Every structure is written in structure tokens, then in C-alpha cells.
Amino acid sequence: DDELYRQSLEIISRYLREQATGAKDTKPMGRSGATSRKALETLRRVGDGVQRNHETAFQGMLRKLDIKNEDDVKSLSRVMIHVFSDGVTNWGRIVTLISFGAFVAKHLKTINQESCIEPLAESITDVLVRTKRDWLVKQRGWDGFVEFFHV
């Protein structure tokens, strides 16, 4: 019933799963998929920049998260909510959110827990769309996201 969440999960889920592994999801994309393909391209060009530019902090935070299993995923949500929700809302901070999601997803594919990439995505999507919905609606959602990072 919730269209922006579902779009957002399709974008975020694919960015993370494709980052943790080698290849893209070749499923055809749901409603608003030309924007989702574009937003996904944007997350690849800017997400990788953000990940290489913050590696040491990402390595620190990923290492003190000590993620074993899928039940660890949703105590993780507490530290990410704590770090993401209370300050300034803008597109850079949301892209940093999704890029650390890709970082942790890669780690989880290393420790043979790729089955936890999707719950992670869901949690990230749910945290972004819940606490930021009004902002996302007034900034036009993913079309605004693509236009903001356009080159």
C-alpha cells in the first residue's frame, strides 16, 4: 500500500546486494523504474566515492558492530537510528546512510551471511522513509535525489 517505501527498498536492496556481490539484479523494475535505474546509477557513482572517502570510519564502526547473525541486524538499527535521525536532513547524509549500508553488506557477504543483506536493506529503508517522509515528499523523492547529484 506504501509506494515510496517499496521503491526505496527496491533501490537500496539492489545497491547493497550488488555491492556485496559481483553483479546486478536483472529483474525488471517495478513502478517508477526509470527513476530507480537512474537513482541506482547515482548511488553507484556517488556511493563508491563516499565509501572510499570514509573507509577508516566505516571500518571502525563495522568492526565495533561485531555482526554475527541475522538477529544482530536489528540491534544494529539502534546505532544507525542514533547516528542518522537527530541532526540535519539533506541528500548527502542520506547517501552516506545508504553507502555505509553497502559497506556492511559487503562485510556480510565475506562472513557468509548474505541472507542478512535483505533485512539490513529493509531496516535502512524503513528508517529513512519513516523519519524523513515529509522531507522526501517535498524534495520529490528519488527524482529529487537523482537531480541533486546529476552531472
Please report, as ranges, the residues that interact with ligand 6AL according to CB under 6 A: 54, 57-58, 61, 76, 79-80, 83-84, 87-88, 93, 96-97, 100-101, 104, 124
Residue with smaller CB distance to ligand 6AL, 3 or 53: 53
Concatenated DSSP letters of 31-73:
TTHHHHHHHHHHHHHHHHHHHHHTHHHHHHHHHHH---SHHHH
Residue with smaller CB distance to ligand 6AL, 40 or 97: 97
> Which residue's CB comes closest to ligand 6AL?
87
Q: How far is the CB of 61 from ligand 6AL (least distance, A)?
A: 3
Instruction: Give the angle subtended at the CA of 62 by the CAs of 58 and 68, to the nearest 5°.
Output: 160
Residue with smaller CB distance to ligand 6AL, 15 or 100: 100
Alpha helix (H) ranges present in the chain?
Answer: 3-20, 33-53, 55-65, 70-84, 91-110, 117-138, 141-148
Residue with smaller CB distance to ligand 6AL, 97 or 116: 97
